Amino acid sequence: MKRTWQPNRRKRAKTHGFRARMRTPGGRKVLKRRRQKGRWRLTPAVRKR
Amino acid sequence: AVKKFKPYTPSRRFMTVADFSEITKTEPEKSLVKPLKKTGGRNNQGRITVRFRGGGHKRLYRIIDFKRWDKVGIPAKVAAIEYDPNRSARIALLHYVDGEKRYIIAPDGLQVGQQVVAGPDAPIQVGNALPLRFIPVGTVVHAVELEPKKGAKLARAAGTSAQIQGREGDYVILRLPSGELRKVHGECYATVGAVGNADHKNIVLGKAGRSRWLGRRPHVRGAAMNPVDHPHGGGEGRAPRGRPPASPWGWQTKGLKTRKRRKPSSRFIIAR
RNA sequence: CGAUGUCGGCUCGUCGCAUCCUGGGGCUGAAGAAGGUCCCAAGGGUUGGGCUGUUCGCCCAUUAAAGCGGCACGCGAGCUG
RNA sequence: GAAUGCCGGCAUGAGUAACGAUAAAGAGGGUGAGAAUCCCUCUCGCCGUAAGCCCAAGGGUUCCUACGCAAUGGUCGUCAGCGUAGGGUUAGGCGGGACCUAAGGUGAAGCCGAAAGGCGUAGCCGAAGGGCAGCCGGUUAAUAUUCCGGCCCUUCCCGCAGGUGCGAUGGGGGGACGCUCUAGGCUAGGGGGACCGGAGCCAUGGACGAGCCCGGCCAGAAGCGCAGGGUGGGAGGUAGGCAAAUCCGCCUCCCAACAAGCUCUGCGUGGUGGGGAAGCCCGUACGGGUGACAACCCCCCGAAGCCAGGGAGCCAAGAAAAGCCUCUAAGCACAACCUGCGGGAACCCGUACCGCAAACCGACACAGGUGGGCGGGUGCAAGAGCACUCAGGCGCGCGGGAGAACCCUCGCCAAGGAACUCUGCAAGUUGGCCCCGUAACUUCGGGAGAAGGGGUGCUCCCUGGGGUGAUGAGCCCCGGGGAGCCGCAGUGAACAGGCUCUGGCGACUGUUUACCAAAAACACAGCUCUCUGCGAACUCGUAAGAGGAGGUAUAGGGAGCGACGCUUGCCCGGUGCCGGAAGGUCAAGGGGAGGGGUGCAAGCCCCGAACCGAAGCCCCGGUGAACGGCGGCCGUAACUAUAACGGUCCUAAGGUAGCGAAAUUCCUUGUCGGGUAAGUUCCGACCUGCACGAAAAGCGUAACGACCGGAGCGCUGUCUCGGCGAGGGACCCGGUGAAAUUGAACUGGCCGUGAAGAUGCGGCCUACCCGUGGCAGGACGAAAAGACCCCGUGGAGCUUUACUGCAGCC
RNA sequence: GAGCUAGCCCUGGCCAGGGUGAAGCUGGGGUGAGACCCAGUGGAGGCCCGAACCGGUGGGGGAUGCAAACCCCUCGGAUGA
RNA sequence: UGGUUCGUGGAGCCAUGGGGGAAUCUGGGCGGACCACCGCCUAAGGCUAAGUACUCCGGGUGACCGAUAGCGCACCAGUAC
RNA sequence: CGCGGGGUGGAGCAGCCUGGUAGCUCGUCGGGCUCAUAACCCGAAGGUCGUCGGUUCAAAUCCGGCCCCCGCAACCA
RNA sequence: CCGAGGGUAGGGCCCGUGACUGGGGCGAAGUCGUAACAAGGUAGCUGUACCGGAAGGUGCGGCUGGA
RNA sequence: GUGGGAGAGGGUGGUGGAAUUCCCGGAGUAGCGGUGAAAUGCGCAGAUACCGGGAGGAACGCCGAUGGCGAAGGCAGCCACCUGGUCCACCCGUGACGCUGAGGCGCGAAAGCGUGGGGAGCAAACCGGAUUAGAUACCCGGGUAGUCCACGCCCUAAACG
Ligand SMILES: [Mg+2]
Ligand SMILES: [Mg+2]
Ligand SMILES: [Mg+2]
Ligand SMILES: [Mg+2]
Ligand SMILES: [Mg+2]
Ligand SMILES: [Mg+2]
Ligand SMILES: [Mg+2]
Ligand SMILES: [Mg+2]
Ligand SMILES: [Mg+2]
Ligand SMILES: [Mg+2]
Ligand SMILES: [Mg+2]
Ligand SMILES: [Mg+2]
Ligand SMILES: [Mg+2]
Ligand SMILES: [Mg+2]
Ligand SMILES: [Mg+2]
Ligand SMILES: [Mg+2]
Ligand SMILES: [Mg+2]
Ligand SMILES: [Mg+2]
Ligand SMILES: [Mg+2]
Ligand SMILES: [Mg+2]
Ligand SMILES: [Mg+2]
Ligand SMILES: [Mg+2]
Ligand SMILES: [Mg+2]
Ligand SMILES: [Mg+2]
Ligand SMILES: [Mg+2]
Ligand SMILES: [Mg+2]
Ligand SMILES: [Mg+2]
Ligand SMILES: [Mg+2]
Ligand SMILES: [Mg+2]
Ligand SMILES: [Mg+2]
Ligand SMILES: [Mg+2]
Ligand SMILES: [Mg+2]
Ligand SMILES: [Mg+2]
Ligand SMILES: [Mg+2]
Ligand SMILES: [Mg+2]
Ligand SMILES: [Mg+2]
Ligand SMILES: [Mg+2]
Ligand SMILES: [Mg+2]
Ligand SMILES: [Mg+2]
Ligand SMILES: [Mg+2]
Ligand SMILES: [Mg+2]
Ligand SMILES: [Mg+2]
Ligand SMILES: [Mg+2]
Ligand SMILES: [Mg+2]
Ligand SMILES: [Mg+2]
Ligand SMILES: [Mg+2]
Ligand SMILES: [Mg+2]
Ligand SMILES: [Mg+2]
Ligand SMILES: [Mg+2]
Ligand SMILES: [Mg+2]
Ligand SMILES: [Mg+2]
Ligand SMILES: [Mg+2]
Ligand SMILES: [Mg+2]
Ligand SMILES: [Mg+2]
Ligand SMILES: [Mg+2]
Ligand SMILES: [Mg+2]
Ligand SMILES: [Mg+2]
Ligand SMILES: [Mg+2]
Ligand SMILES: [Mg+2]
Ligand SMILES: [Mg+2]
Ligand SMILES: [Mg+2]
Ligand SMILES: [Mg+2]
Ligand SMILES: [Mg+2]
Ligand SMILES: [Mg+2]
Ligand SMILES: [Mg+2]
Ligand SMILES: [Mg+2]
Ligand SMILES: [Mg+2]
Ligand SMILES: [Mg+2]
Ligand SMILES: [Mg+2]
Ligand SMILES: [Mg+2]
Ligand SMILES: [Mg+2]
Ligand SMILES: [Mg+2]
Ligand SMILES: [Mg+2]
Ligand SMILES: [Mg+2]
Ligand SMILES: [Mg+2]
Ligand SMILES: [Mg+2]
Ligand SMILES: [Mg+2]
Ligand SMILES: [Mg+2]
Ligand SMILES: [Mg+2]
Ligand SMILES: [Mg+2]
Ligand SMILES: [Mg+2]
Ligand SMILES: [Mg+2]
Ligand SMILES: [Mg+2]
Ligand SMILES: [Mg+2]
Ligand SMILES: [Mg+2]
Ligand SMILES: [Mg+2]
Ligand SMILES: [Mg+2]
Ligand SMILES: [Mg+2]
Ligand SMILES: [Mg+2]
Ligand SMILES: [Mg+2]
Ligand SMILES: [Mg+2]
Ligand SMILES: [Mg+2]
Ligand SMILES: [Mg+2]
Ligand SMILES: [Mg+2]
Ligand SMILES: [Mg+2]
Ligand SMILES: [Mg+2]
Ligand SMILES: [Mg+2]
Ligand SMILES: [Mg+2]
Ligand SMILES: [Mg+2]
Ligand SMILES: [Mg+2]
Ligand SMILES: [Mg+2]
Ligand SMILES: [Mg+2]
Ligand SMILES: [Mg+2]
Ligand SMILES: [Mg+2]
Ligand SMILES: [Mg+2]
Ligand SMILES: [Mg+2]
Ligand SMILES: [Mg+2]
Ligand SMILES: [Mg+2]
Ligand SMILES: [Mg+2]
Ligand SMILES: [Mg+2]
Ligand SMILES: [Mg+2]
Ligand SMILES: [Mg+2]
Ligand SMILES: [Mg+2]
Ligand SMILES: [Mg+2]
Ligand SMILES: [Mg+2]
Ligand SMILES: [Mg+2]
Ligand SMILES: [Mg+2]
Ligand SMILES: [Mg+2]
Ligand SMILES: [Mg+2]
Ligand SMILES: [Mg+2]
Ligand SMILES: [Mg+2]
Ligand SMILES: [Mg+2]
Ligand SMILES: [Mg+2]
Ligand SMILES: [Mg+2]
Ligand SMILES: [Mg+2]
Ligand SMILES: [Mg+2]
Ligand SMILES: [Mg+2]
Ligand SMILES: [Mg+2]
Ligand SMILES: [Mg+2]
Ligand SMILES: [Mg+2]
Ligand SMILES: [Mg+2]
Ligand SMILES: [Mg+2]
Ligand SMILES: [Mg+2]
Ligand SMILES: [Mg+2]
Ligand SMILES: [Mg+2]
Ligand SMILES: [Mg+2]
Ligand SMILES: [Mg+2]
Ligand SMILES: [Mg+2]
Ligand SMILES: [Mg+2]
């Protein structure tokens, strides 16, 4: 059947990107938490040009 | 007149379509004056706030003239009468000698080629606009302003009118389509005649689809729902209500008057 | 009750006997034929259809007879639902 | 030592199940330490509106090559999408960005909000939509519309040359638009040819023949030619297009009424550039040479594509902005802009490869899902259908045998035809086309494919229309009549309704429990009530604000009923809602009669009665397509029987019509009648309606239903009642190799006993040790800390005239 | 968190081939003029048969599956809500 | 209405959102309703070290652990997945 | 089986809960109006209060046991 | 070839019969009421419409077969 | 044909006053309505009676007649428009062109039906209050269709002289 993962580079970027997270206090805290944690990747790596 | 069909299909046996014979050879509209992009959307910034809206034909807005006092004294020739997707009535395309082209909402009896004009001057004829004062008591009228210089707001639906009843210092009394008795300021413009397309009420949609074409989504009964959804939801195999009938939001829907009492508008109203 | 699947049907059965049939027998208000009733006897047999989910039962047409009950109302790690 | 404890390790089932589609394999030769599995050749089979080909998303080295096989591959592996390394992605014209705007997002102005923040006209961001200049070949092992070859373009910048008042983010025009049906001419694509080109070939009885087989094109500037799209030209007047305007708009006169003329596309042609089969020889994994100076011509079918803003009809009335044309304002007119020709300038990012899939989404080389374009040939009425087949791509990454039970899938049957079963569930009969011919009823459309019939191949003769062609031959579609031939059978294979009668419910097409319910449920047009005068009512939000709606009573919100026909009776006592400037009560406040506490007092400080005090409640009416409700007991007619009539008690009023053992009937298989040999169902009645009944609508209704019941016909393996055959497993051999379960085990029957159902206790009976295929009675077999039931002063969801608050409205 | 699913907004795309033959238009008839009736044309429709595509009706298989919704036969819709 | 031990209590003091609304030393607040007395302070403007908190970081010590412990990580771990 | 309502003149109903009196309509019987009947008018009659038991000074009335009558209930399996 | 007739299938008319049901008719002395005939005690009749145990009543309009 | 005459003949539009009912303002009390008699009902929440304004619908007093017109049904304030039938005179024109009339077609009171209006009065049904043995009637107080308009059906009658 159709499963739940339907990859889209634009969606992933607009949805979970560094700039989206930065836009709101909710998201800014996510970066803070991930930084303090020592996460190698703050936001998902969306590729291609 | 109303177009009628034979039952060559079920739902074609009741279906019924407007007569478009008053639609003069001018079916597609007029750029310049109108159209605008019209912005379909069944809801506010976010959430739906009027249920069951959506779908249905794309539209172009015809930006019509609801304040006729710009062109006081300037007459215009009625050039055409065309279909307007965004109202019950039809619209008149008129050419002002000025050059300017406006649309007026098209009254009953309006003929193409006719002369029409607005102002204190203005022969009392179908199509003309006047401040309510100079209009003879008892004449039927439409596109009436509520307060002066604020635009036509009463009687624009197809086949509607108001009748002038009497006067009272600065106000003339109106009898509105609903039957209400209203004091409306003398200085309010209103155009003589009834609205026309009066056979609009006689049309039978005929099937579900037609409803959808006009963007009317299926309306579901409270009875059909559940207690979470509606006061009428549940219980077992059908149910008669079990309380005084209500809206989904709990207010009673048979009888409960809802106009706020202390409206300052009150001292200008005399009926139902 | 940290699970003993619950009606009926189907399939496969097996057992009890307080025997429906057939075998033996006493009494009969048993002439004979056919019955009634009781005793001995389970070796084998104990039909096909209509309605009902039905068990049971009421019918239809037969038959030697169309027996009753136990087996977790026998049998769902065999089927049906 | 126990926690269905936690982590780790190793067992058991077990050499068991399986090895992922039943599209299919055989052989010969290579290479190698090692071949069913790799490379090659011959044969066989499968897809072919794909299982072929090209894009888009996603993927991100998987692409190419050399070297390798420990792991990854459901077996093997010399092979690989795997390991090591090295290569490989070339753009002014293809796509995206130095262009535009949509929803939406952002947001200077502004508004709002405890803070975080929320709205937000302008502007900006935002794309498969708009705009925009490259076509055909050739080369690499791997890239090419990117490199190269030919032919053809677009921008800027700088020149000269010639024109003109040039000139804005501003005015106007255009861009610019729906659905269905379509005309004319074109191309793509295809079929035919006795014509042209070509290696070759006479086979096995015949054929050296208009014999067989193969191929007969592609791009192409200007200029033409055929199609076809766009558009009227002047002169005045002007108050509108938010400054201006010669532009546009409007009024008035002339000339055209036409595509005549200008343009703008498409298509044919075109200077010239390229391609070019079979077969044969070769050594490649694969391609090369020759065939070739290849030929490159004529007919025919013909689009859904092009001309494209084509036309016709319809209602539901079908983006925006820029590019482009124009008009003028600031300004400038030694500027500038337009046109012609030259030279120069022309960046950034993507490009490999997979891509209906072993490279994407499903943990897997997963029988699943995944948007667009092409998708040939014959035959079948047509077609993207179906059977075979081009090109092209595969044989589905474990094999070999055997020929039991049993399972799955399939084929056939004597005789009977539903006796099967909850039920004809399943399977069968039917089946395409043409022609005859079709009932009740009906909303006059339908019912209708009703039902029931016949025809269907090949051959020869005569013969009617068109289409392309000149009015002709041919080529191509539709037809008619007449003789005859063959078989069991002519839509000879494949795709392709079984039919009727009669009830229930729902009118109808629709919709729904993604993953057990598709229905009689939801929706539906339509009907009625009800609120709403517009800063509407209602909804979201603390607000600002937005939806409603750029709508205005023929309109919008809420409720219910649910096409249509005939209809919807009585009760306002209670509850709701509606209407009532009286009255009663009623909080804060007003008011202070009177009293209290302190002071030597002036004073300061407390309570406090009349009386004035709102909505609300009470009170007075109305309102049932508002919440709802719509009786009991005795008697009576000149056969009995029954009760039109009556008495009496109560009510707010006492169930009308129309239905009725029903989706409603307990007693119940009610009671007659009909279908049957037989009928707890079904159908027609009766009415004693436990417990119908009129908008939670009443009784009907043509048509419609993968709904539900009853019946008959046809036909059958459903059954009497089975039998045989096929294939994939099962079984045996080689290869890989799981699982839940498991206190331990050396794990028999009976009759007892035991926590009351014993392999394990007692007695007796039986029984040598160990396996393999099978059947499931049992281990109260596995699986889930029972779903039901109860418990816990456990939890949630729901309701209301439970309590208490809150929003909201007054 | 709406890359599954639900609705709506913006912008594009898809639906082979067959049947049936509404209005309308034309001619004819009819009348004082009509309605109306015949043909012919015409190509309507939540119209019909049926691929794609979208569904998920009945039966069987699958049940440590190919698959945590599949497969086969059969079936509904297929210019529209 | 909040704060304080103070939950309306005899409920003050301190703070306030709403209404009313002064005085400048013979002026005002306070000492638990209120009043008298006797006393204490001097509102409606601001700044002010030190003693106090913490431990990402460096240093010392341990009747603290010793790779199922000790931080999740002694090991390229906030990694693989 | 459970629960709660009811048996009062011939008929249908009050009368109970706050014990002492049995009342209403109809019917019936006698008289009148009428030719006659009904209607109407004037008088009258009629009740072991379901039975058993006692509580009381005293029971239709209060409390028990039975007896018919009526309505409700009987759910989860 | 045709053809009596047989078979199949679907119709049209007619007759017989059918639980139950609608009204009709006739039947010496049954129940209920008083509609009409005298102004029949509400003048009657009427077409239609609704309502009612029954005759019937009422609404609308008409008639002289009444004043 | 020429020339005139009467008429509620028909259709459409417009308009006038009287009267009822409701609304508001005034003034004003203790009852009004209604019947054979009463009651229901309305009225101290301010009725009835009277005055002033407003709205709305329907019907047209006197003229009016025992009258006129029409083919019948039917037709009544006034105005204008559109239109039918009809009679008198003059004896001018055509010149037998005539009568009836199965069927057909058209009209057709009221009631009723469909769709949308409008709704003052009256008023089937229905609800009360009286009357009665009982009244689903006659009387009274309420009151929905309908009565009115438009269009479309219905085709009946003591459509009667
Ligand atoms: Mg525009
Ligand atoms: Mg919002
Ligand atoms: Mg938002
Ligand atoms: Mg609904
Ligand atoms: Mg529900
Ligand atoms: Mg609720
Ligand atoms: Mg129910
Ligand atoms: Mg409810
Ligand atoms: Mg248990
Ligand atoms: Mg257990
Ligand atoms: Mg014995
Ligand atoms: Mg004997
Ligand atoms: Mg059965
Ligand atoms: Mg049993
Ligand atoms: Mg037995
Ligand atoms: Mg038992
Ligand atoms: Mg059992
Ligand atoms: Mg078992
Ligand atoms: Mg079941
Ligand atoms: Mg222990
Ligand atoms: Mg373990
Ligand atoms: Mg095993
Ligand atoms: Mg085995
Ligand atoms: Mg095996
Ligand atoms: Mg790699
Ligand atoms: Mg190699
Ligand atoms: Mg391997
Ligand atoms: Mg490779
Ligand atoms: Mg590699
Ligand atoms: Mg740049
Ligand atoms: Mg941009
Ligand atoms: Mg925008
Ligand atoms: Mg924002
Ligand atoms: Mg932009
Ligand atoms: Mg773009
Ligand atoms: Mg481009
Ligand atoms: Mg390549
Ligand atoms: Mg411009
Ligand atoms: Mg522009
Ligand atoms: Mg030979
Ligand atoms: Mg060319
Ligand atoms: Mg200007
Ligand atoms: Mg070659
Ligand atoms: Mg066009
Ligand atoms: Mg712009
Ligand atoms: Mg210019
Ligand atoms: Mg590339
Ligand atoms: Mg490529
Ligand atoms: Mg594809
Ligand atoms: Mg594989
Ligand atoms: Mg694998
Ligand atoms: Mg796959
Ligand atoms: Mg697909
Ligand atoms: Mg094709
Ligand atoms: Mg073909
Ligand atoms: Mg075909
Ligand atoms: Mg195919
Ligand atoms: Mg395989
Ligand atoms: Mg057989
Ligand atoms: Mg046979
Ligand atoms: Mg048969
Ligand atoms: Mg049977
Ligand atoms: Mg049986
Ligand atoms: Mg059946
Ligand atoms: Mg079947
Ligand atoms: Mg049926
Ligand atoms: Mg049926
Ligand atoms: Mg349905
Ligand atoms: Mg679905
Ligand atoms: Mg489901
Ligand atoms: Mg279905
Ligand atoms: Mg309806
Ligand atoms: Mg708004
Ligand atoms: Mg709006
Ligand atoms: Mg409404
Ligand atoms: Mg409903
Ligand atoms: Mg319903
Ligand atoms: Mg009702
Ligand atoms: Mg009530
Ligand atoms: Mg009341
Ligand atoms: Mg009430
Ligand atoms: Mg009230
Ligand atoms: Mg009050
Ligand atoms: Mg019955
Ligand atoms: Mg019932
Ligand atoms: Mg029978
Ligand atoms: Mg029977
Ligand atoms: Mg019901
Ligand atoms: Mg109801
Ligand atoms: Mg219904
Ligand atoms: Mg359907
Ligand atoms: Mg049968
Ligand atoms: Mg079989
Ligand atoms: Mg086999
Ligand atoms: Mg093996
Ligand atoms: Mg042993
Ligand atoms: Mg035992
Ligand atoms: Mg032992
Ligand atoms: Mg033992
Ligand atoms: Mg076992
Ligand atoms: Mg087994
Ligand atoms: Mg078991
Ligand atoms: Mg178990
Ligand atoms: Mg438990
Ligand atoms: Mg339970
Ligand atoms: Mg408790
Ligand atoms: Mg036609
Ligand atoms: Mg069509
Ligand atoms: Mg369809
Ligand atoms: Mg179909
Ligand atoms: Mg299903
Ligand atoms: Mg406090
Ligand atoms: Mg203070
Ligand atoms: Mg103080
Ligand atoms: Mg102090
Ligand atoms: Mg003190
Ligand atoms: Mg400080
Ligand atoms: Mg550790
Ligand atoms: Mg260690
Ligand atoms: Mg650790
Ligand atoms: Mg007497
Ligand atoms: Mg008969
Ligand atoms: Mg009879
Ligand atoms: Mg009598
Ligand atoms: Mg009489
Ligand atoms: Mg009389
Ligand atoms: Mg009458
Ligand atoms: Mg009456
Ligand atoms: Mg007054
Ligand atoms: Mg005249
Ligand atoms: Mg003469
Ligand atoms: Mg005649
Ligand atoms: Mg009539
Ligand atoms: Mg009438
Ligand atoms: Mg009616
Ligand atoms: Mg009517
Ligand atoms: Mg009245
Ligand atoms: Mg009356
Ligand atoms: Mg009387």
From Swiss-Prot, chain A:
**What is any one of the record's Gene Ontology cellular component terms?**
ribosome
Name of the protein described by the UniProt record? Large ribosomal subunit protein bL34
Q: What family, per the record?
A: Belongs to the bacterial ribosomal protein bL34 family.
The record's keywords, sorted A to Z, are: Ribonucleoprotein, Ribosomal protein
Output the Gene3D superfamilies linked to this UniProt entry: 1.10.287.3980
Query: Which organism does this record belong to?
Result: Thermus thermophilus (strain ATCC 27634 / DSM 579 / HB8)
What extra comment accompanies this record?
Answer: The open reading frame (ORF) for this protein is entirely within the ORF for the RNase P protein (RnaP). The two start codons are separated by four nucleotides.
- Gene label: rpmH
Check the UniProt entry and state the signal peptide residues, or none: none
GO terms, molecular function: structural constituent of ribosome
Q: Where is the composition biased (Basic residues)?
A: 29-49
Pfam families from the UniProt entry:
Ribosomal_L34
Q: Could you tell me what this protein does?
A: Found on the solvent side of the large subunit.
Oligomer and partners:
Part of the 50S ribosomal subunit.
Q: Which cysteines are joined by disulfide bonds?
A: none
Give the span(s) annotated as Disordered: 26-49
Name the GO terms of the biological process aspect: translation
Curated annotation (Swiss-Prot), chain B:
Q: Where is the composition biased (Basic residues)?
A: 256-272
Quote the SMART domains the UniProt record gives.
Ribosomal_L2, Ribosomal_L2_C
| GO terms (BP aspect) | cytoplasmic translation
Q: Which UniProt keywords apply?
A: Ribonucleoprotein, Ribosomal protein, RNA-binding, rRNA-binding
Name the GO cellular-component terms: large ribosomal subunit
Instruction: Kindly give the PROSITE patterns that the UniProt entry links to this protein.
Output: RIBOSOMAL_L2
Record carries keyword rRNA-binding = yes
Which intervals of the chain are annotated as region Disordered? 222-272
Please list the residue ranges that the record marks as compositionally biased, kind Basic and acidic residues: 229-239
Q: Name one Pfam family in it.
A: Ribosomal_L2_C
Q: Which GO molecular function terms does the record list?
A: rRNA binding; structural constituent of ribosome; transferase activity
Q: Which domain of life is it from?
A: Bacteria
Q: Can you state the subunit structure given in the record? A: Part of the 50S ribosomal subunit. Forms a bridge to the 30S subunit in the 70S ribosome, contacting the 16S rRNA. May also make transient contacts with protein S6 during translation in the 70S ribosome.
Q: Which family does it belong to?
A: Belongs to the universal ribosomal protein uL2 family.
> What does the function comment of this entry state?
One of the primary rRNA binding proteins. Required for association of the 30S and 50S subunits to form the 70S ribosome, for tRNA binding and peptide bond formation. It has been suggested to have peptidyltransferase activity; this is somewhat controversial. Makes several contacts with the 16S rRNA (forming bridge B7b) in the 70S ribosome.
**What is the protein's given name?**
Large ribosomal subunit protein uL2
Species:
Thermus thermophilus (strain ATCC 27634 / DSM 579 / HB8)
